[PDB]
Design a protein around this ligand. Structure first.
Ligand code: BCB
Ligand code: BCB
Ligand code: BCB
Ligand SMILES: C/C=C1/c2cc3[nH]c4c(c3C)C(=O)[C@H](C(=O)OC)c4c3nc(cc4[nH]c(cc(n2)[C@@H]1C)c(C(C)=O)c4C)[C@@H](C)[C@@H]3CCC(=O)OC/C=C(\C)CCC[C@H](C)CCC[C@H](C)CCCC(C)C
Ligand SMILES: C/C=C1/c2cc3[nH]c4c(c3C)C(=O)[C@H](C(=O)OC)c4c3nc(cc4[nH]c(cc(n2)[C@@H]1C)c(C(C)=O)c4C)[C@@H](C)[C@@H]3CCC(=O)OC/C=C(\C)CCC[C@H](C)CCC[C@H](C)CCCC(C)C
Ligand SMILES: CC(C)=CCC/C(C)=C/CC/C(C)=C/CC/C(C)=C/CC/C(C)=C/CC/C(C)=C/CC/C(C)=C/CC1=C(C)C(=O)c2ccccc2C1=O
Ligand code: HEC
Ligand code: HEC
Ligand code: HEC
Ligand code: HEC
Ligand SMILES: CC(C)=CCC/C(C)=C/C=C\C(C)=C\C=C\C(C)=C\C=C/C=C(C)/C=C/C=C(\C)CC/C=C(\C)CCCC(C)C
Ligand SMILES: CCCCCCCC/C=C\CCCCCCCCOC(=O)[C@H](O)CO
Ligand SMILES: CCCCCCCC/C=C\CCCCCCCCOC(=O)[C@H](O)CO
Ligand SMILES: [Fe+2]
Lengths: 332, 243, 323, 273
């Protein structure tokens, strides 16, 4: 019901502005323990010999690796994605060139997506980068995904109650609330802002006075847009385990420069990255997945901020395997 | 173009801001602060035109009151600075100075909406009673600040307009008289009424009513003021610093 | 201490009083009853109550609004009674989410909200006539009705006048516990931080000031209750020591004072101005100011602070940045 | 310089400390020991505000701001330019406010009236202490306190709120707000009532105590009464802060999540989840 002190507090603004993080030490410790399960990098191996483009039959993304390097990637992918089932989660055990199991074809696309994040979206992931583990955390289905309607629990490894299930209509408002940090905002910010690039998050004027021609009647955006933006911000705050002041001086949410932190610009790039992942890599996978993986509108599961971040301002507290697995990007 | 924009770097909200402050300062300084001066002026040692009220039971009053008579104050200056405090020259309780002071209210009985005496003992207000659950103080002793019994409660005086008790009346031991005390100066217990504002002996000089079963507005003031005086004057120590 | 200022030690009971009004005496309903525990800190008498046409109309119109709101809330939980009780504070009836301008919106997207607002407006107008007319029937001034009028006007500004001035019903206040609260932030955000609206500041100064004034005046009268300071009407017409001491307490503390009549003018005015100031701020918002923080920067009033973390350029402006 | 009825009340007595030494008036102002101590702290405080303000960027009254130290200074002394002025001014303010209260006690005693006003004034002083002293002590830095600037203190309030995502969902805030609003309404109704009785209009008769009770019995079915509305107004106003203080002190020291999530105690009960 309450959280016992001490609280951990940081400062993100000029003294006297009450800007900063507010953290519960036991909560931070528990997330650190969970994130520390990240398997360590595999031992380095032989860099010389022919490329597997020559050695194997059906290697389309990782063709420039040596055999030892390529089998190291396969070992790593297995631990990160399908450790309980092993190689045969994706492979026909009698023919490793076979693409007959749906996870194989998905994993090839995922290799391309991972390389794209680490190559094309350094404005977000920097030199920390992502691996399969960042999202998957040891299971074929990542624990935090989104459909085109809100779903509970947020962590799909938990069993839902009857009222949490998406088919139970009476539970809708709670499904929405638990995605916007318990607010009553009547908007799903995943489908509005993160599934694609159709909407503008910004709602605040950049002039003192109302501009003639955009400020009256149907010229205007409805006030609903401002509630939806607040819902997205509530959801992002909770996804990172943080508050508005990590990114903004609330004096003026719409101002950059001294009124925004460096982390806000990183967040902006994160929105763009997530939209690219969803539109171009994840949504098209509905054609490759079984019916049982799809939502009620035939959609594949997609990513939001929580998919990687899982309640921390940096996924896995900034742990990295980038230099350990150069084949996941950045690709030259 | 912009909605609200005027010639210069002026805009409509900007002009409204000046207006709002002008209104507020006008209301405060030219209206409210003038209403504040309808009592106590002219000052001793910008004014509004007098205000007349038509009274509920006939007649009018114009405020501030000008009284055809003037009371003598038994006070001596303690020193000669403009703002030095004054000091009693007799018994301040009986002389009614300082916190024992009363106002020259009308010598008329406060009335109910129907024209009856408003504040009356229960011996008169025979339709009134004490709520079940509360102490009936009649017949209980009154114990003064010195722990000495000053007398015995004889009646309660009720406000017939608000249905609320305002005074107790007690017989004053040894003095062949009764006295009123406002209930605000009474700690009502099951076995006694405790009064810490005055000492037992000081009950003998409580202002007397002209009539046994009614009280004037001025008499109410004289009665209440006497006990308040005790807070400062019941003993010599009460005027000195607490610490 | 004056224990009477804490509670009534000895309560009085007498025949109930009825003051005749110019009309309506036969429309008072209820047998009064007495609460001993309430009588410790107030009058023990409860009832009777006046009916009358404007009160009955208020109840009918208001009940209609309430039923529209509740029915829509129930629909929000698919009419599950347990979920209604659980989720109640999160449920609401919303203005239109799409931009239809000043078009009467579809029932399913703002229409029922506009209808509830109409019946709520009729209810408030009906109640106003009751508050006004009861004062007249009893030969009293209409000071309460005019204060109540400012409060109603403020509700009309946020409910329909602002929406009409900008031309969009989407900007109205939702019905519901959390949802009407959610609006405060959406509206502040949209219009560039309400902390920077001068009229928001005026309203707060007056609202805080009502707190200051009721504490001070409430306490002052309790402090002079021993002299009958609570009998304020005859203290006005015939000044007694209660309000002489009250005035001198303030004169000696702050160097000036009021009268027992004029303190009530101060309080009435402060209360009125919470609502008048809020209304003027709302009427200027969207109409003539789009971003209050930037309007203050324009006029050189906004505080500025040094960077703590490094100043951060808008990445949307970077060369080749996506939209 | 005196009201017409004032002379008979200007007697010696009622002081808490000092005796006759400071028992006098300057114009309409009572002095006393706590008058002297209040002037001392006001003079010191306002002098520090001037000196501090002259070292800053601006003389515009809206934009001036005297700010507490960075969090990293903890509860220690900070350099004068980087939080120390704030610290010194906070001490002066508390000195001034408490002096003001105790002076009101002296004035009350001299007039033979109750001490309800200075007791009531303890409430805002307490709330200042919650914001500036108690909460910062619990979090372990003076830097959590609010800055002294007409507009800057609103920037603090604003960021503080949003550090808990939506402060409107703070239960102690909800109580505080409800009291603010009911108090304002009740002051309107009370002021209005009294004026309506004493000012019926035209040549009409002033009305009565009975008419006041009739008005509210007719309109809402209950009249609280003429003494009781004064106790109620003091209760309502006081509870703005007395309940708010719990919401302020909770935020950080006893709750680190957003405020809306606090309501999971209710929403997340297993039998209706
Ligand atoms: C947790 C929330 C807080 C808060 C939130 C807040 C809001 C949201 C708003 C204000 C506003 C105001 N606040 Mg602030 N506030 C203020 C003072 C002020 C005034 C500048 C102004 C009007 C207040 C008013 O009329 O009240 C009622 C009292 C009345 C009517 C009597 C007159 C008081 C007088 C106006 C006070 C003037 C103080 C000056 C700055 C002088 C400072 C002293 C000098 C001599 C050194 C003080 C002196 C304090 C102290 C000592 O604690 C304080 C604490 C807080 N305020 C907390 C931090 N206040 C409003 C404003 O317009 O700010 C720009 C406003 O919108
Ligand atoms: C993040 C969002 C913020 C916000 C957003 C905000 C908005 C959008 C508005 C205000 C407004 C106001 N704000 Mg602000 N605010 C306030 C204080 C206030 C109020 C004094 C003032 C007027 C509102 C009022 O009294 O409503 C309470 C009184 C009401 C609602 C009157 C109701 C009267 C009605 C006759 C009652 C009817 C009852 C019936 C029984 C109903 C029956 C219904 C049935 C039939 C369906 C403080 C003290 C603070 C602090 C300390 O931070 C603050 C911060 C904020 N406000 C943040 C900046 N605030 C208003 C204003 O001044 O704007 C310029 C306003 O519109
Ligand atoms: C985005 C942020 C928000 C926010 C953040 C917020 C915070 C962080 C806090 C509040 C608090 C409060 N807010 Mg809230 N707020 C409020 C209302 C209120 C107040 C009732 C309450 C207490 C204010 C206080 O501490 O004053 C303090 C005033 C003081 C201490 C005055 C001290 C006076 C001193 C003793 C004497 C001063 C004398 C001068 C120096 C003398 C000058 C000399 C001259 C005059 C001669 C409303 C009505 C709204 C609306 C309408 O939306 C709102 C929205 C918001 N608030 C936003 C959601 N608010 C406080 C609370 O209780 O929260 C639970 C609080 O901590
Ligand atoms: C600064 C000035 C302030 C101010 C001033 C004033 N405020 C007044 C007056 C003044 C002067 C009056 O004279 C009038 C009144 O009479 O006082 C006793 C009134 C009022 N202020 C109320 C509520 C209020 N004021 C608020 C705010 C402020 N006020 C601001 C602060 C707020 C906030 C803050 O949210 C609230 C909630 C009501 C009690 C009352 C209107 C009743 C009505 O209009 O009812 C109309 C509606 C009905 C009669 C319908 C009733 C339906 C029942 C419940 C049927 C059941 C439904 C069923 C289940 C259906 C299915
Ligand atoms: C719930 C309880 C309520 C309540 C109750 C009561 N309120 C009282 C009494 C009661 C009973 C009195 O008896 C007393 C008084 O005499 O009344 C006329 C008083 C008073 N309430 C004042 C201000 C007030 N009440 C507020 C709030 C409530 N009041 C709440 C609502 C607010 C808000 C809300 O912001 C304000 C600004 C003064 C006018 C007066 C003290 C003067 C003083 O103490 O003189 C002594 C001190 C000075 C004259 C100046 C001191 C300058 C210092 C050293 C330097 C400045 C430091 C400062 C910290 C900088 C801030 C700047 C920045 C924020 C911009
Ligand atoms: C010159 C010098 C240095 C002298 C030294 C001696 C000394 C200590 C002097 C003090 C100098 C100082 C510090 C002065 C500043 C005084 C202050 C703090 C003034 C603040 C005034 C403010 C802003 C007040 C806010 C409240 C307000 C709006 C009040 C206006 C209405 C009034 C006056 C209400 C008081 C009042 C109330 C509340 C009643 O109920 C009542 C009932 C019956 C009769 C009269 C009254 C009455 O007068
Ligand atoms: C899905 C997550 C996989 C798991 C688990 C394992 N492998 Fe894999 N394998 C996968 C893909 C998408 C591909 C093609 C990669 C490309 O760049 O296109 C492969 C390929 C192979 C091959 C090459 C076979 C051939 O084409 O002749 C081999 C020999 C191989 N993989 C081995 C292997 C082993 C030993 C694994 C467990 C340790 C293993 N894979 C797991 C997808 C996935
Ligand atoms: C988050 C941004 C991800 C990263 C990085 C990687 N994957 Fe992923 N995966 C992600 C989502 C949102 C989904 C759809 C949900 C689903 O479980 O189907 C997937 C799916 C897969 C699958 C199919 C699992 C199944 O349906 O049984 C596989 C085999 C897979 N992903 C593999 C994979 C690999 C090998 C990765 C690194 C190279 C990798 N993923 C990264 C999200 C994310
Ligand atoms: C960083 C991790 C953020 C946190 C935490 C919060 N916000 Fe944010 N905000 C962020 C970005 C990157 C953007 C711009 C997005 C884009 O695509 O352009 C925003 C935007 C806003 C806005 C709109 C500003 C405008 O120009 O119209 C608002 C009103 C806003 N954000 C508010 C807000 C609130 C209330 C937050 C906490 C609940 C919050 N934000 C958190 C980045 C981040
Ligand atoms: C995995 C594919 C991610 C997704 C989806 C999102 N973020 Fe991310 N984020 C990711 C990494 C690997 C990093 C570390 C980069 C580094 O500099 O160490 C980050 C970092 C951030 C940060 C910065 C935190 C800090 O610097 O202290 C922010 C503010 C952030 N990410 C925000 C954010 C948002 C708002 C997202 C959804 C829109 C989001 N991220 C998705 C990886 C991934
Ligand atoms: C049964 C018991 C006894 C009572 C039940 C109480 C109850 C549960 C009520 C319902 C749930 C609750 C508590 C809801 C609360 C909602 C709240 C707090 C709402 C607050 C504010 C809403 C506002 C200001 C809306 C204003 C809307 C308007 C002013 C609309 C105006 C529209 C018009 C004037 C129409 C003119 C235009 C024309 C074209 C039709
Ligand atoms: C400010 C709003 C005040 C609300 C107080 C309502 C009190 C309810 C009283 C109703 C009286 C109804 C008559 C009772 C007698 C019936 C026999
Ligand atoms: C703080 C205000 C809290 C809000 C509560 C208000 C209800 C009224 C209680 C009054 C108590 C005063 C004792 C009266 O005290 C006195 O006058 C003495 O002489 C003290 O001994
Ligand atoms: Fe009063």
């Amino acid at each position: 019901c309450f959280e016992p002190p001490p609280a951990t507090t940081t400062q993100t603004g000029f003294r006297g502005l009450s800007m900063g993080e507010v953290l519960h030490p036991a909560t931070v410790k528990a997330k650190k323990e969970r994130d520390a399960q990240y398997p360590p990098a595999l031992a380095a191996v032989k860099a010389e010999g022919p490329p597997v483009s020559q050695v194997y039959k059906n290697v389309k993304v990782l063709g420039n690796l040596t055999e030892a390097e390529f089998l190291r990637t396969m070992t790593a992918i297995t631990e990160w994605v399908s450790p309980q089932e092993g190689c045969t989660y994706c492979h026909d055990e009698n023919n490793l060139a076979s693409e007959a199991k749906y996870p194989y074809v998905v994993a090839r696309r995922m290799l391309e997506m991972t390389r794209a994040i680490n190559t094309n979206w350094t404005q977000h992931v920097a030199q920390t980068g992502v691996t399969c583990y960042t999202c998957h955390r040891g299971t074929p289905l990542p624990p935090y995904v989104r459909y085109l309607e809100p779903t509970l629990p947020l962590n799909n490894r938990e069993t839902p109650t009857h009222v949490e299930r998406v088919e139970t209509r009476s539970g809708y408002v709670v499904r929405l609330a638990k995605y916007t940090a318990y607010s009553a905002l009547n908007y799903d910010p995943f489908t509005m802002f993160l599934a694609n690039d159709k909407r503008q998050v910004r709602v605040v004027p950049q002039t003192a006075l109302p501009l003639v021609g955009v400020s009256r009647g149907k010229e205007r955006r409805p006030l609903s847009d401002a509630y939806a933006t607040f819902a997205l911000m509530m959801s992002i705050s909770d996804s990172l385990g943080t508050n508005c002041t990590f990114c903004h001086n609330a004096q003026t949410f719409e101002s950059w420069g001294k009124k925004s932190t460096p982390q806000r610009a990183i967040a902006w790039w994160g929105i763009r990255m997530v939209r690219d992942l969803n539109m171009n890599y994840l949504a098209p996978l509905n054609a490759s997945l079984p019916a049982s993986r799809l939502g009620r509108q035939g959609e594949a599961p997609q990513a939001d901020c929580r998919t990687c971040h899982q309640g921390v301002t940096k996924p896995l507290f900034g742990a990295s395997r980038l230099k350990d697995y150069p084949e996941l990007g950045p690709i030259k | 173009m912009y909605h609200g924009a005027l010639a210069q770097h002026l805009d409509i909200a900007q002009l409204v801001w000046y207006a709002q402050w002008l209104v507020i300062w006008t209301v405060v300084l030219l209206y409210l602060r003038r209403e504040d001066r309808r009592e106590g002026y002219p000052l001793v040692e910008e004014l509004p035109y007098p205000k007349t009220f038509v009274l509920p039971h006939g007649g009018t009053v114009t405020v501030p009151r000008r009284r055809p008579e003037t009371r003598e104050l038994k006070l001596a200056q303690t020193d000669g600075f403009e703002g030095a405090p004054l000091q009693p020259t007799g018994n301040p309780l009986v002389d009614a100075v300082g916190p024992a002071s009363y106002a020259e209210r009308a010598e008329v009985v406060d009335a109910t909406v129907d024209g009856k005496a408003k504040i009356v003992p229960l011996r008169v207000a025979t339709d009134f009673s004490i709520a079940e659950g509360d102490v009936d103080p009649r017949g209980l002793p009154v114990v003064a600040a010195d722990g000495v019994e000053a007398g015995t409660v004889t009646d309660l005086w009720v406000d017939r307009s608000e249905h609320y008790f305002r005074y107790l009346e007690l017989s004053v031991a040894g003095s062949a008289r009764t006295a009123l005390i406002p209930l605000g100066f009474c700690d009502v217990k099951k076995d006694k009424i405790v009064v810490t504002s005055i000492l037992s002996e000081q009950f003998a000089n409580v202002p007397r009513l002209q009539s046994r079963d009614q009280i004037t507005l001025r008499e109410e003031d004289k009665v209440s003021a006497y006990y308040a005086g005790g807070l400062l004057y019941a003993t010599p120590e009460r005027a000195e610093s607490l610490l | 201490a004056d224990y009477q200022t804490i509670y009534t030690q000895i309560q009085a009971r007498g025949p109930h009083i009825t003051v005749s009004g110019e009309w309506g005496d036969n429309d008072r309903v209820g047998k009064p009853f007495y609460s001993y525990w309430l009588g410790k800190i107030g009058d023990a008498q409860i009832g009777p109550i006046y009916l009358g046409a404007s009160g009955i109309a208020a109840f009918a119109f208001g009940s209609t609004a309430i039923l529209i709101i509740l029915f829509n809330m129930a629909a929000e939980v698919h009419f599950d009674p347990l979920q209604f009780f659980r989720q109640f504070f999160w449920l609401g009836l919303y203005p239109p989410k799409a931009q239809y301008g000043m078009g009467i919106p579809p029932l399913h997207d703002g229409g029922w909200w506009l209808m509830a607002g109409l019946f709520m407006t009729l209810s408030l107008g009906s109640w106003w006539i009751r508050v006004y007319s009861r004062a007249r029937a009893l030969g009293l001034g209409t000071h309460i009705a005019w204060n109540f009028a400012a409060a109603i006007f403020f509700v009309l500004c946020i409910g329909c006048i602002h929406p009409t001035l900008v031309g969009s019903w989407s900007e109205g206040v939702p019905f519901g516990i959390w949802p009407h609260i959610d609006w405060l932030t959406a509206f502040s955000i949209r219009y560039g931080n309400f902390y920077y609206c001068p009229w928001h500041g005026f309203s707060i100064g007056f609202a805080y000031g009502c707190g200051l004034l009721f504490a001070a005046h409430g306490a002052t009268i309790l402090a002079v209750a021993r002299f009958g300071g609570d009998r304020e009407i005859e203290q006005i017409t015939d000044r007694g020591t209660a309000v002489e001491r009250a005035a001198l307490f303030w004169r000696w503390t702050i160097g000036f004072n009021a009268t027992i009549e004029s303190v009530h003018r101060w309080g009435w005015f402060f209360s009125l101005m919470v609502m008048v100031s809020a209304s003027v701020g709302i009427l200027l918002t969207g109409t003539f100011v789009d971003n209050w923080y930037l309007w203050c920067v324009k006029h050189g009033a906004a505080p500025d602070y040094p960077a703590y973390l490094p100043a951060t350029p808008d990445p949307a402006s970077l060369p080749g940045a996506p939209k | 310089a005196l009201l017409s009825f004032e002379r008979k009340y200007r007697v010696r007595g009622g002081t808490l400390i000092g005796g006759d030494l400071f028992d006098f008036w300057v114009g309409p102002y009572f002095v006393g020991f706590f008058g002297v101590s209040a002037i001392f702290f006001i003079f010191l405080g306002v002098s520090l505000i001037g000196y501090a303000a002259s070292q800053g960027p601006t003389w515009d009254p809206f934009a001036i701001s005297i700010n507490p130290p960075d969090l990293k200074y903890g509860l220690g002394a900070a350099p004068l330019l980087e939080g120390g002025f704030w610290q010194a001014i906070t001490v002066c303010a508390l000195g001034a406010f408490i002096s003001w209260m105790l002076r009101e006690v002296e004035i009350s005693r001299k007039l033979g009236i109750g001490w309800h006003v200075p007791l009531a004034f303890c409430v805002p002083i307490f709330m200042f202490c919650v914001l500036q002293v108690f909460r910062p002590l619990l979090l372990g830095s003076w830097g959590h306190a609010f800055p002294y600037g007409i507009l800057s203190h609103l920037d603090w309030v604003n960021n503080f709120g949003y550090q808990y995502l939506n402060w409107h969902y703070n239960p102690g805030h909800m109580s505080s707000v409800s009291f603010l609003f009911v108090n304002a309404m009740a002051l309107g109704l009370h002021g209005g009532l009294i004026l309506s009785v004493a000012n019926p209009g035209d040549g009409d008769k002033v009305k009565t105590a009975e008419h006041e009770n009739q008005y509210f019995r007719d309109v809402v079915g209950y009249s609280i009464g003429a003494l009781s509305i004064h106790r109620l107004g003091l209760f309502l106003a006081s509870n703005i802060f007395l309940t708010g203080a719990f919401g302020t002190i909770a935020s950080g020291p006893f709750w680190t999540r957003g405020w809306p999530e606090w309501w999971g105690w209710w929403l997340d009960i297993p039998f209706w989840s």
